[PDB]
Symmetry: C2
Subunit: 68 residues, 2 copies
């Protein structure tokens, strides 16, 4: 796992939760990590079809549209 748990716990508290189980924080961190990886994988293929090696913000923005 790359994402730290603490910041994910703050997101859920920030959205209005009174109490958050430790298992809720870990579940959302793993779901967002898996989303990040699938978006990143699609952004890499977009950059390669554009002839580039550098992943740019427009690749991320176009890749997220396949998941919406």
């Amino acid at each position: 796992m790359e994402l730290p748990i603490a910041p994910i716990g703050r997101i859920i508290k920030d959205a209005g939760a009174e109490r958050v189980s430790d298992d809720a924080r870990i579940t959302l961190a793993k779901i967002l990590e898996e989303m990040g990886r699938d978006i990143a994988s699609e952004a890499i293929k977009l950059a390669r079809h554009a002839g580039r090696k550098t992943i740019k913000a427009e690749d991320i923005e176009l890749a997220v549209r396949r998941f919406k």
Copy 2:
């Protein structure tokens, strides 16, 4: 912003990118943060319709299904 950028950069490198612009890392961190907040907001309403104050892993798992 709650999520740190560095770990998001590692996710994109881990998925296979050779080089990542700083703007790509920031864009994906903001998209995952916004997803985390919308999931968390829906999980809070599920827990309240179940009569609970504590957000649990099953609330997260049911809330992500509205976005798939």
